[PDB]
Structure formats: structure tokens, C-alpha cells
């Protein structure tokens, strides 16, 4: 094992590789979401942009994890990336529900890794997560929940009209 | 025939003159569309501007074709320009449907000319079309289809209100 | 099928989805290559940067293909992304050999799609590829071949020293 | 004891004083390393600069610890500073090996203090270390390991030549 490795368990090393896979899968899911909203028969540009920027954020999260893996002397191992869960994503409301489920699953994976780090007495890992992921995730989930509430208020009213207005006046 | 003409069939020469006529007719149709939306009893300024800019684009397309005709040593021949197909164009939805039909007909004329060029082994013609028309047309048809979808989503809801909102928040 | 679709075969539509998968797989392979060269026991920063920028180029290629799919009225379909072919990539010479093999395979997929487009008389597709992919790929393959020749000249001489010098004076 | 002291154990107070001594000793060791590489019979300016900047970083670390000691109401206590472990430091490779051993020993002292803080439920201490030391140390150890790998690749080849090239093209 590495000349630099110190206080870095094989358990954390493996869980970091699994989290990289989760973040790349999330990136891929957002890519599919973004391009679905660019379809000529969907055509919500603000929604497409919201999801495409999240695809970039999640890829950046994976990259940060891979950089940290190398800084600690662990070894990146990549696995197949499963396709997204759907090929068509419904309405903006359906899509945002799927996105908040996905973010909560990433958040739970972060909390599980933090707990592992704490059991392993790995404070560099705990600080890394705290500093670069946990607050980011909380803020994003809050934003999504705000969006869900606004979308729901709009599309209870008159669904197409509300979906257009949300895109135009919140997202764009 | 011209001192400069080389590899330029009479078949392409004539088809180019016909395409000039199609593009000027399209320009004329957009002029009528634009001024219909400026009527005091229609009064959708963003829609009028959308169509008036397309009238200018189609005239510019004709001019490019005429410049190319002369560059190749062909001879521009003009024919009567038929009036547009309607004197009143209905709702924004009706108008955008008529505009996408018109653009698909121009696109099909471009593809037919390209095929002729390819049968005649005229790569200058093929490159000209590829470079200055085919991608332009695809992008425009995609934009129109996006607009149709947004208009349809709005005017299913409450038709006058949706038509105003589309004009104000997408077109203007 | 789409209100905008015109002259866009189901054969091209499917082959475009397959090419998106090839380009994302290539991106993933470059991500693994880049992070391998960032290992503390490999530690060739210029090499890591070369491959990480190629990961971004290939992702951008996929995105362009997906944008074009939607512009034509086709439907993006994503499949699982297979992991890269290796977990460790050897020397810079080994890595660059693997990268040129990968780029030739992408190039062959582009040429095959172009041939399909030509058989389908789809000049928008042919122009898209010509304009945004084929020359890009030729230039990249030439650059890689230049690199291979320089690496081989260096590491025939005294292998570690040559690998350092290439990184420092060509890549960095 | 101090009018400001709150939740600050005598165990942490003493361990902080010991860590100040470790950091000043490390500073002193880097001063000796730096000036060894400035000898006319060693004469590797980039290496001298690398170590002299580390002498400044370690002194700055001690100063931060002393500032924190006073902020918490503890009392700085200084002890004799032991001389560095060697008077001559060999090759760049020997020196960098000695530097990574030294940094791992500082890192282990940081982890031990963090564990003490955690046993004492002293989150201000834990955050201080996390924020100002633990990531700094990981990044430095990674850099040193990168350097070791490059030095080893060079001096396996032809030792004097490799040592010059590393100094010139990585350090300087
Ligand atoms: Au921890
Ligand atoms: Au041709
Ligand atoms: Au073609
Ligand atoms: Au603590
Ligand atoms: Cl372990
Ligand atoms: Cl799956
Ligand atoms: Cl002829
Ligand atoms: Cl008529
Ligand atoms: Cl078909
Ligand atoms: Cl596989
Ligand atoms: Cl105490
Ligand atoms: Cl001593």
C-alpha cells in the first residue's frame, strides 16, 4: 500500500469508490432529465438548464471524491454506470420529485460515509464531507423542496399554464 | 454560356431559380403574417416581430442563392410571386402551424436540390447548401416546434390569457 | 413521431444513440486515465491534465450529439455505461497507445454513421459530422501519433528519465 | 485558571504545548535541510527553496497553535528544542524521504490530538485542527509522495543528471 497512506481504512477507500459511482450515476440521470426537457414536444428551456447544471455539479462532486482518494493514497476503482431509472420524465413536477428522491439518496450515502469515518476515527474524511458535500446537499434539497411547493401551487390551478409560468419566472 | 461556368448543370441552374422564387414567396408570406399581428384587433407585438424577422431571413436566403447563381455562371430568372395562402392568419397557434408547414416545404426543396446536386456531382452546390441553409432550417424548425408546444400548453388552459403570456414572456 | 421530424431515419436515430454511448464511455475511460496519472506512485501531472481534458472533450461530443438528436426530432435513449477496459494503465506509452486505439474506434464509428447518412440521403447528418467531429478526430489522432513517436524516442533511451522529460517539456 | 477558559481540559492544554514543540522542531529540521542544499558542494537551489518554505510553514503552524492556546485560556509553556536528526542530508531522494517521515509524524500527532479532543468533547479544538492543519498535512504528504516518485524515476536512470533535472524542472 501507498507510501503516503495514513489512517485511511480499506472500508472508507471502498465506500469512497461506491460514492463516486453514485455521483456519476446521478450526473447521468441529470443529463437524461436535461435533454428530455429539450425535446420539441416538452420544450421547457429553464428546466433543461436547471438539470444540465446539476449534471455538472454531480460530475464535479465525483471528481472531488477521486482527487481526495488519491490524496489519501487510496485507489480509484470504476464500475459500470447503470442507466437512469426512466427514459421519459413526465411533467416538471414529476421530474422534480424524481430529483429530490435522488438527492436524498446521495445525502443518505454521504451521512453513511461520515458515520463510517467517525467509527474509523478518520477526521480528515469527516471534515472533507462536512466542508464540500453535506451543506451543499442540504441547500440543494431545500431549493428543490421550494420548487416542488411552487410547482404544486401552480399546477393545481391550471396545469399547462402553471408549468410555463414556473419555467419562465422561477427557472429561466 | 458563361466564360466562368464549370460543372454547373442546367438542371441545378433552373432549380436554383425555382428555390429563389420559394424563398421570396416565403418572405412575402411572413410579411403578411407580421402585419396581421400588428392589426389593432390582433395586437401581439412579439408575434409581429417574430414574423417580420423571418421575412428578412427568407429574403436574405434568396439573395444568397442569387449571388451563388452568378458566382457559378448561371442566369437569374424571376417569375411572378404568388400571394400568400391566407389574408388572415387566426391565432398565434394557427400562425405558427402555418409557419412550420411553410418551413418544412422550404426544407424539402433544399433536400431535393441537394439530391440533384449529388446526382450531378456538384460538390460546390452541396457544400453551399450544407453551409448556409440546411442547418439554419433545422434549427428554425426546432424553434418553431418548441413554440408550438408552449403555445398549445398555454391555450389549452385559457386561450386569450395563454396567448398574451406567450407573447409577453417568450417572444417579446 | 415528432411534428418537426423530416428526413430523419430510425436507423440514424438509433445509431446516434449508440454513438452517444461510445462518446460517454470514452469520456469515462479518459477520467480513469487522468486519475491514474494523479496517483502518488505515478505522479505525472501533465499526463493527468492531457487525459482529463480529453474526458471533457468527449463529454462535449456526446452533448452535441444529444442536442442534434433533439433538433432532428429523434429521441435520446441512454444505456448502461460499461466501465473502462483497465483499472491501471501502465506507462505513459501504454496509456497513449490505449488512447489512440480508443480514438480510432470512435473515428470508425463516425465514418460508419456518415456512410449510413449517405445511404439514407441525410445531408444534414453528413454536414453535422463533417463540421463538428471528423476533422476534430483526425487532428487528435495526428497529435497522439506525434506524442507516441516522441515517447518512444525517449523511453528507448532511459525509460524513467524519458517519461519525466516528455511530461515536463511536451505536456505540461 | 483563566476568566475565559471554558471546556478546555488540562490534557488538551498540555498536548497543544507538546505539538508546538513538534512543529518548532520540524521548522528547525527544515532550516537545516534548506541550508544543506545551499552548500557549494550540494548546490540545488530549488531544493533549498522547497525546504526553507516548509521551515516557514511549520513555524506558522506553531504560531497558530500558540494563538489558539491563548484564545482558549491555556498557558504556553516552551521546552528545549532538540536539534535535527542529521547534520548532512544526503541526496534529494534521501532528504525527501526524511521530510515525508517527519510530516507523517506531525500528522500522527495531529490525529492523536484530535482523538483527545473528541474524547474530551472539545469541538472547538476538533474544528481548529480540521480547518487549519489536517487537510494542509494531507495535501503536503501527497505532494511529497509525488516528488518521491518523480525523483526515484529519475535517479534510477542516471543519478546526478536526474537530480539536476528534478531541481530544474519540478522545483525551481
Ligand atoms: Au471523524
Ligand atoms: Au454533391
Ligand atoms: Au449525406
Ligand atoms: Au470534538
Ligand atoms: Cl483498513
Ligand atoms: Cl440498470
Ligand atoms: Cl447541363
Ligand atoms: Cl396564388
Ligand atoms: Cl426510417
Ligand atoms: Cl464491461
Ligand atoms: Cl481538565
Ligand atoms: Cl537530540
Amino acid at each position: 500500500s501507498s507510501q503516503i497512506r495514513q489512517n485511511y481504512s480499506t472500508e472508507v477507500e471502498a465506500a469512497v469508490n461506491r460514492l463516486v459511482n453514485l455521483y456519476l450515476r446521478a450526473s447521468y440521470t441529470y443529463l437524461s432529465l436535461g435533454f428530455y426537457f429539450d425535446r420539441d414536444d416538452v420544450a421547457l428551456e429553464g428546466v433543461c438548464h436547471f438539470f444540465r447544471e446539476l449534471a455538472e455539479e454531480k460530475r464535479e462532486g465525483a471528481e472531488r471524491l477521486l482527487k481526495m482518494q488519491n490524496q489519501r493514497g487510496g485507489r480509484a476503482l470504476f464500475q459500470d454506470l447503470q442507466k437512469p431509472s426512466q427514459d421519459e420524465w413526465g411533467t416538471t413536477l414529476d421530474a422534480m420529485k424524481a430529483a429530490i428522491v435522488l438527492e436524498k439518496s446521495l445525502n443518505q450515502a454521504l451521512l453513511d460515509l461520515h458515520a463510517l469515518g467517525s467509527a474509523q476515527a478518520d477526521p480528515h474524511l469527516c471534515d472533507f464531507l462536512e466542508s464540500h458535500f453535506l451543506d451543499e446537499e442540504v441547500k440543494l434539497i431545500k431549493k428543490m423542496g421550494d420548487h416542488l411547493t411552487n410547482i404544486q401551487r401552480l399546477v393545481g390551478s391550471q396545469a399547462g399554464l402553471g408549468e410555463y409560468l414556473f419555467e419562465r419566472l422561477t427557472l429561466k
Side-chain angles (χ1 to χ4, degrees), chain A:
Chain A
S1 90
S2 178
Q3 66 197 158
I4 66 173
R5 192 175 182 143
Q6 182 172 213
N7 196 222
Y8 193 62
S9 66
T10 58
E11 295 83 357
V12 163
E13 178 181 13
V16 168
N17 284 151
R18 284 197 295 275
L19 192 57
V20 166
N21 192 90
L22 294 176
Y23 267 70
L24 292 175
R25 201 193 163 184
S27 186
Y28 198 19
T29 292
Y30 288 128
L31 182 71
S32 175
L33 277 155
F35 280 93
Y36 170 76
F37 285 99
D38 182 64
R39 285 170 52 161
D40 74 275
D41 64 355
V42 181
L44 294 163
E45 192 183 328
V47 185
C48 174
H49 188 63
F50 177 79
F51 293 127
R52 292 192 65 201
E53 298 285 332
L54 288 175
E56 170 188 338
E57 296 309 293
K58 299 304 157 179
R59 166 181 60 80
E60 287 169 351
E63 292 174 7
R64 189 179 310 267
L65 285 156
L66 288 163
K67 172 172 187 194
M68 180 274 288
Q69 182 79 295
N70 278 341
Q71 285 175 155
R72 294 296 306 271
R75 293 294 173 254
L77 283 182
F78 295 99
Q79 311 286 345
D80 298 331
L81 293 194
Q82 293 155 241
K83 72 178 188 175
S85 68
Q86 309 176 209
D87 294 326
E88 297 187 293
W89 296 99
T91 67
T92 301
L93 180 57
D94 294 321
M96 198 70 64
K97 285 179 180 171
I100 205 171
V101 167
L102 172 64
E103 289 303 326
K104 290 170 141 175
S105 77
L106 292 181
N107 196 220
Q108 190 59 239
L110 294 170
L111 294 175
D112 286 352
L113 182 59
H114 193 288
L116 175 63
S118 171
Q120 296 287 334
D122 189 341
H124 182 273
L125 178 75
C126 285
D127 170 73
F128 172 81
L129 296 175
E130 284 168 11
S131 298
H132 306 290
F133 289 82
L134 295 185
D135 193 36
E136 295 58 36
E137 263 320 289
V138 159
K139 281 173 190 319
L140 180 60
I141 292 163
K142 173 61 164 65
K143 181 184 276 212
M144 292 177 175
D146 290 359
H147 289 343
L148 283 172
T149 292
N150 281 100
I151 296 157
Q152 181 63 56
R153 160 201 280 140
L154 287 162
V155 296
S157 288
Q158 299 205 260
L161 168 64
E163 195 163 26
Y164 177 77
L165 285 173
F166 182 76
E167 183 268 342
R168 290 287 92 182
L169 297 181
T170 293
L171 293 178
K172 223 307 192 188

